Amino acid sequence: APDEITTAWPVNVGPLNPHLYTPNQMFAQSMVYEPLVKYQADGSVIPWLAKSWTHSEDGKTWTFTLRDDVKFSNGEPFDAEAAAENFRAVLDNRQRHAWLELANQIVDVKALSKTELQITLKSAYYPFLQELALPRPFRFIAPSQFKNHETMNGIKAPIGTGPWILQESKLNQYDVFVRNENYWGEKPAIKKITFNVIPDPTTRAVAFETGDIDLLYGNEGLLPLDTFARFSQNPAYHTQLSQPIETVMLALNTAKAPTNELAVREALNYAVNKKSLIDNALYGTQQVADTLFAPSVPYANLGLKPSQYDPQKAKALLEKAGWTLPAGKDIREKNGQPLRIELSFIGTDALSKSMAEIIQADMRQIGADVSLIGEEESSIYARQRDGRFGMIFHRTWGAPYDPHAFLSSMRVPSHADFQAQQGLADKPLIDKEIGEVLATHDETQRQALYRDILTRLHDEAVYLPISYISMMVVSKPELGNIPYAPIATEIPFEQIKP
């Protein structure tokens, strides 16, 4: 069955509620649900469900001209009234979408006609079209599939306009997708897709080698990186490694001792041998990161000065700040307090564990005692929320979230980035400037605000950037070259040709 493929994912795709988050899998939601505008690697958005659009001179009112030939998979039509209902179902659950600023921006959505949709905004929101293009929540399910005329409490059938339809879902075993034969756009060459539920990275690698699955598509945690490096040399397999898509990094808690001292955060940024870490743990498959965002990120080419590996400077910074070595000890003290920092991470993640040891060892050389706290997933998420960490592993989100969306969510208390920065003296000014840069339409001021925000975060050493990571692909040669989706969390199944 060449026109059919089998792949794998750690968990099930979920109920596929377009307006909700976990356990829903973003790649799966983007397979079924579609946006008004499609994000492109160009950095632009192109028409999709909305074939064109105008906006008022103050950029507060937007009128979208939708297509008239788009049906939901069940047969029901997609029109401006359906769109409006979806935005209403979403905005009735507005508080949960606080991370995403557009959900706080939309004042009204109404169908002017069957093909005219009007959206009104609190202000001129620059990232409007980008956040309309996101996998969630602003995508469309058939209003019939609502429950009590809402979606926040669940849906019935995941009926979308996209080129794929969920056909079967047996928990902890598999999910089966089929091609929407009445898809309005172009037909995918593949008809059937099977997602084997395989929670363990090694077990996924083993699954591929035995030929049980035909494709693996994910980030640097897709499969063991030593195994991936081996696959790349195996002429029976095909592998890929995209341009970098996002930053992997440490978040330093500016509100908790001793990471509340700028000198300490600065010294930590000088302490890690990143190239060694990347050669050792990442098997040279990623790039070294010096800044929160790579220079290639929009508005992020600022000429920020890198803090490169310099143990001697790291020591002198600590020495100067009052962190000295007691007699016969390797760990520094100050005011009776030892230089001890808690690095918490998911304990069943071999990569994080492997990255944590190196960091612990590197920072021990500069007189810092790092305590590896490996906990389960839920615990680490809880620490991130409540800001109960010294150091923590963190990720940026890639296009099109970087930089505006990642920056925007720094204002949300529930997020690790707010907690990490909570000890900053300029945290209100930063948060104020983040709100401004989203709503300003002066391009000179926008770049000026982005510079000031990123520079401050850089100059305050809030983060310890480690690497810029890439997308990884492992596939049977028969599938050919596998394209990359413009959005890091999407998997372009509709582009693959067996």
Does position 397 bind ligand 9YK by CB under 6 A? yes
The Cα-based distances of 177 to 47, 85, 180, 194 in angstroms read: 26, 26, 9, 6
> Which span sits near ligand 9YK by CB under 6 A: 19-27, 115-123, 176-184, 199-207?
19-27
Torsion angle, CA of 143/148/154/157, rounded to 10 degrees?
Answer: -40
Smallest separation (angstroms) from ligand 9YK to the CB of 397:
4
Distance of CA 427 to the CA centre of its chain: 23
Smallest separation (angstroms) from ligand 9YK to the CB of 283:
23
Q: Under the phi-then-psi rule, with left for phi > 0, alpha for psi from -120 to 50, and beta for the rest, what region is 375? A: beta
Does position 6 bind ligand 9YK by CB under 6 A? no
CA distance 439 to 461: 27
Does position 22 bind ligand 9YK by CB under 6 A? yes
Q: Does residue 39 contact residue 133 with C-beta atoms inside 8 Å?
A: yes
Smallest separation (angstroms) from ligand 9YK to the CB of 395:
7
CB atoms within 10 A of CB 480: 12
Under rule CB under 6 A, how many of the chain's residues touch ligand 9YK?
Answer: 8
> Which span sits near ligand 9YK by CB under 6 A: 21-29, 222-230, 297-305, 454-462?
21-29
Task: Looking at 300-415, list the stretches that DSSP marks H as alpha helix, in order from N- to C-terminal side.
Answer: 311-321, 350-364, 377-386, 404-408
In the complex with ligand 9YK, which residue's Cβ is closer, 39 or 397?
397
Does position 489 bind ligand 9YK by CB under 6 A? yes
Q: Does residue 147 contact residue 141 with C-beta atoms inside 8 Å?
A: no
Does position 99 bind ligand 9YK by CB under 6 A? yes
Nearest partner of 338 among 353, 349, 322, 360, judged by Cα: 322
Does position 265 bind ligand 9YK by CB under 6 A? no
Does position 446 bind ligand 9YK by CB under 6 A? no
Provide the mask over 309-338, with x wherever binding to ligand 9YK is found by CB under 6 A and - wherever it is not.
------------------------------
Smallest separation (angstroms) from ligand 9YK to the CB of 99:
5
Residue closest to ligand 9YK when measured from CB atoms:
21
Query: What does DSSP assign to residue 495?
Result: G
Nearest partner of 151 among 16, 328, 5, judged by Cα: 16
Does position 172 bind ligand 9YK by CB under 6 A? no
Does position 33 bind ligand 9YK by CB under 6 A? no
Smallest separation (angstroms) from ligand 9YK to the CB of 41:
16
Among 30, 39, 126, 136, binds ligand 9YK (CB under 6 A): 136
Nearest partner of 25 among 50, 7, 49, judged by Cα: 7
CB atoms within 10 A of CB 495: 15
Smallest separation (angstroms) from ligand 9YK to the CB of 12:
15
Smallest separation (angstroms) from ligand 9YK to the CB of 443:
26
CA distance 70 to 280: 51
> Which span sits near ligand 9YK by CB under 6 A: 20-28, 191-199, 304-312, 463-471?
20-28
The C-alpha angle 181, 183, 185, rounded to 5 degrees, equals 135
Smallest separation (angstroms) from ligand 9YK to the CB of 103:
11
Smallest separation (angstroms) from ligand 9YK to the CB of 366:
29
Does position 408 bind ligand 9YK by CB under 6 A? no
At 80, the amino acid letter reads A
The Cα-based distances of 122 to 58, 104, 133, 295, 400 in angstroms read: 11, 8, 19, 32, 22
> Which span sits near ligand 9YK by CB under 6 A: 18-26, 140-148, 202-210, 262-270?
18-26
Does position 21 bind ligand 9YK by CB under 6 A? yes
Smallest separation (angstroms) from ligand 9YK to the CB of 310:
30
The C-alpha angle 378, 428, 296, rounded to 5 degrees, equals 70
In the complex with ligand 9YK, which residue's Cβ is closer, 231 or 418?
418
| Residues contributing to the site for ligand 9YK (CB under 6 A) | 21-22, 26, 99, 136, 397, 401, 489
